[PDB]
């Protein structure tokens, strides 16, 4: 029971500041511990980008020596992140945790993005097999959602009464704006019968496009 | 740096099972190890530190040795809150450095993908794009490989590939593969054709369509 949590803005343009805080309780970071903070990239991989220990004393990894700060306000419990002209390789979840007896406690990570972007509501083009393949016993069908920003969007088929093989593919940068897509499997007679509508929410541009699957 | 090598990258374990999972420095880092879990979604948690030693709240079915630049973790009787992902990491010396991580995900018996490939919508080629996408669905194991042929000629470039988690009712993986051309070059070719190829078939899995059809 040692805490800490991370907080600061979660989008910062390239080239500016990357700023973020670690507020800890139940633990004073004057008295014992490396207070540290460490990225998870996009892919899972980590690394390790410095500390300042308990007496003030700091550590940064060569690999970001020329653009990091680290430092702490003993008065409020607090350490801080400052990362000088990012680009969008710095995109990561930031992590703040103490070492000593290994690395035992973790904030609960905060992904920061940097981007140039400006919110864009997306394309939605659905998804239905081209004619010519006729099919077997199920039918998939789908939604492209391109052209997006910032990350967010929920892909709702019909009312959610469809979770009959809902696949949710993880958004990718690509030109700038994000693209995911979903699929949806249903018996091959239910549709096109019945109405399948895939209905695409991006609540960052108050924006919601449904589309109706339609044959051929 | 030291550089910090973990094996297997990934592992298809049941609940009851143990697991055996190890790190390899390019140097001896004597015991200066520790081991850490990322449950999905979530934040990480300290298992081990010094090669052996067990952090506050952590069960006994955790452990952990090894000396010079190779060590290991085990964790014995898997409960399904074990099933996430493990790293060890280096402290003998600046900067530390982290292994690529092991992921512990569930068993299950092999299943081929159900493999659908679709024709840019038009309303996107309205707009001067052609995408072609094929979804790869409920397949496993997680290893697969997708292939795209333009006409009979196998086409890499403008190729992006999107995989979900392990699926939390079955178990299996899916993909997206989708192959993004100008509307231009599109309506030059006639068959779009994706290749699945994956362990529960000596063969790929074709799916085609014609541009000039319909």
């Known amino acids: 029971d040692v805490q800490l949590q991370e907080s600061g803005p979660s989008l910062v343009k390239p080239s500016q500041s990357l700023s973020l805080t670690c507020t800890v309780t139940?633990?004073?970071?004057?008295?014992?511990?490396?207070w540290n903070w460490i990225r998870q990239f996009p892919g899972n991989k980590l690394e390790w980008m410095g500390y300042?220990?308990?007496?003030?004393?700091?550590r940064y990894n060569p690999s970001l020596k020329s653009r990091i700060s680290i430092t702490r306000d003993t008065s409020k419990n607090q350490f801080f992140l400052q990362l000088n002209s990012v680009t969008i390789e710095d995109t990561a979840t930031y992590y703040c945790?103490?070492?000593?007896?290994?690395?035992?406690?973790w904030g609960q990570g905060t992904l920061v993005t940097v981007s140039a972007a400006k919110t864009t509501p997306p394309s939605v083009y659905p998804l239905a097999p081209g004619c010519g393949d006729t099919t077997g016993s199920s039918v998939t069908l789908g939604c492209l959602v391109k052209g997006y920003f910032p990350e967010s969007v929920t892909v709702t088929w019909n009312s959610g009464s469809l979770s009959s093989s809902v696949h949710t593919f993880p958004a990718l940068l690509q030109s700038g704006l994000y693209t995911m897509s979903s699929s949806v499997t249903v018996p091959s007679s239910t549709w096109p019968s019945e109405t399948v509508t895939c209905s695409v929410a991006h609540p960052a541009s108050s924006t919601t496009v449904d589309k109706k699957l339609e044959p051929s | 740096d030291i550089l910090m090598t973990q094996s297997p990258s990934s592992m298809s374990v049941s609940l009851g099972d143990t697991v055996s999972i190890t790190c390899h420095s390019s140097?001896?880092?004597?015991?200066?190890i520790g081991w850490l879990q990322q449950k999905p979604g979530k934040s990480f948690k300290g298992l081990i530190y010094?090669?052996?030693n067990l952090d506050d709240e952590v069960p006994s079915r955790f452990s952990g040795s090894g000396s010079g630049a190779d060590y290991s973790l085990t964790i014995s009787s898997l409960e399904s809150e074990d099933f996430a992902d493990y790293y060890c990491?280096?402290?003998?010396?600046?900067?530390?450095?982290f292994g690529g991580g092991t992921k512990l995900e569930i068993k299950r018996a092999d299943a081929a993908p159900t493999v659908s490939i679709f024709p840019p919508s038009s309303e996107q080629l309205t707009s001067g794009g052609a995408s072609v996408v094929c979804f790869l669905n409920n397949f496993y194991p997680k290893d697969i490989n997708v292939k795209w042929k333009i006409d009979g000629s196998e086409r890499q470039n403008g190729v992006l590939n999107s995989w979900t988690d392990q699926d939390s009712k079955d178990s299996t993986y899916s993909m997206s593969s989708t192959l993004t051309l100008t509307k231009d070059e599109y309506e030059r070719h006639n068959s779009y054709t994706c290749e699945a190829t994956h362990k529960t078939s000596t063969s790929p899995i074709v799916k085609s369509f014609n541009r000039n059809e319909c």
């Open positions: 945790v103490t070492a000593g007896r290994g690395f035992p406690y």
């Open positions: 139940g633990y004073s970071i004057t008295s014992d511990f490396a």
């Open positions: 300042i220990s308990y007496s003030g004393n700091t």
């Open positions: 140097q001896d880092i004597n015991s200066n």
């Open positions: 010094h090669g052996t």
């Open positions: 990491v280096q402290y003998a010396q600046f900067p530390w450095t």
